[PDB]
Amino acid sequence: SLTNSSLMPTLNPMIQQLALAIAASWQSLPLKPYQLPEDLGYVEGRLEGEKLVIENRCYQTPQFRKMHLELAKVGKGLDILHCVMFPEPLYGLPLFGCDIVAGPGGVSAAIADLSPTQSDRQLPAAYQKSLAELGQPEFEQQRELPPWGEIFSEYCLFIRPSNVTEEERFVQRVVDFLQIHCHQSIVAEPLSEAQTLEHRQGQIHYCQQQQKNDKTRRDLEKAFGEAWAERYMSQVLFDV
Ligand SMILES: C=CC1=C(C)C(=O)N/C1=C\C1=NC(=C\c2[nH]c(/C=C3\NC(=O)C(C)=C3C=C)c(C)c2CCC(=O)O)/C(CCC(=O)O)=C1C
C-alpha cells in the first residue's frame, strides 16, 4: 500500500491515480515481497541543485517473478511513475508496463502496454477477446514508438493527455489491462521446458531493448555516477 509514501502527496494527480489503481490491482494477487538491495528501496540525492527522490516497491507471485512500482520526483520540475510486472517464464504471461512523465504543468507522456513474451510476439486469444470486448478508447496526440520500441505490443497506448478526461480514461484503460492480466494469471498453466526458455529470452530481450533509453540512465549518471546508475539499471529497473 502507499500510505507510507513520502512522495505521493507531491506527485502529479494522474501519477497518484495510477499508483492507486496499480496497488488495488496487485492486492488481489497472492503477493509475496521481492527483495531489492537494502539501499535502493528509497533513494535520495541531488541532480544539478535539485533534490532527487525515488521510492521503489517490489513484490512477486508464483506467476510474476518481479512486480516493480517506482515513484520519483527528479527535482521539482519532473515527476515519474514507472511500473513493470515481470512474468515468471514457466507461465508465459505477457509483460505489463506503464510509464508516466509529468511536471507541474501536466502530463507530457503516458504509456501502458501488455508486451507479448512469446516468440510469435503475440497475445493469448483470451486477452485479444477480452481486450476487444472493450473497444478502441479515444485518443488524441498519439506518440512515436522508437526503433528500440519493437518489444512493445499493439494494444499499447502512448499519448499526451489533454484534459482531466483523457487522463481518467488513460487510468481506466490501465485498470482494464490489469484486470484482464491478473485474471489470466491465476489460471495460467506451467509451460514446457523448451518454451519457458523462449519466454525467458522474451524477457531478457525486453529488459535490454528498453534499457535503450539513456534518459533514465543519463540522469542517474549525473546524480550518482555511472557505476551506481549501471547497478540501478541492472538491479532495479531491468534485472537479467
Ligand atoms: C518504457 C518507457 C520508458 C522507460 C523504461 C523509461 O525509463 N522511460 C520511458 C519512456 C519515456 N521517458 C520519457 C522522458 C523522460 N524521462 C526522463 C527522466 C526519467 N525517467 C525515469 O524513469 C527516471 C528515473 C528519470 C530520471 C531520473 C526524462 C528526463 C525525460 C524527458 C522528458 C520529455 O522529453 O518528455 C519519455 C518521453 C521522451 C520522448 O517522447 O521523446 C518517454 C517515452
DSSP 101-128: EE-SS-EEEEEEEEE--SSS----HHHH
Give the C-alpha distances (Å, rounded to integers) separating 163 from 12, 108, 135, 151, 193. 13, 12, 21, 29, 48
Residue type (1 letter), 121: R
In Å, what resolution does this model reach?
A: 2.2
Q: Which residues contact 4 (CB under 8 A, 6 or more apart)?
A: none
Q: Residue with the nearest Cα to atom 5 of ligand 1?
A: 210
Q: How many domains would you assign to the chain?
A: 1
Which range of residues forms the domain containing residue 126?
Answer: 1-240
Identify how the structure was determined: X-ray
- Main-chain dihedrals φ then ψ at residue 167, nearest 5 degrees: -85, -45
**Residue 194 phi, psi dihedral angles, 5° rounding:** -95, -75
Q: What CATH number is attached to the domain comprising 61? A: 3.40.1500.20
Candidates 129, 135, 11; CA nearest to 69 is 11
Q: Please choose, from the candidates 189, 188, 190, 233, the residue with its C-alpha nearest in 3D space to the C-alpha of residue 211.
A: 233
Q: Record the cell numbers describing residue 131, joined without a space.
A: 481486450
Q: If you measure from the C-alpha of residue 211 to the centroid of ligand 1, how many angstroms do you get, rounded to a whole number?
A: 11
Instruction: Say if ligand 1 is within 6 A of residue 82 CB.
Output: yes
C-alpha count within 13 angstroms, C-beta hemisphere, residue 184:
23
Give CA–CA dist 85/190, Å, rounded.
18
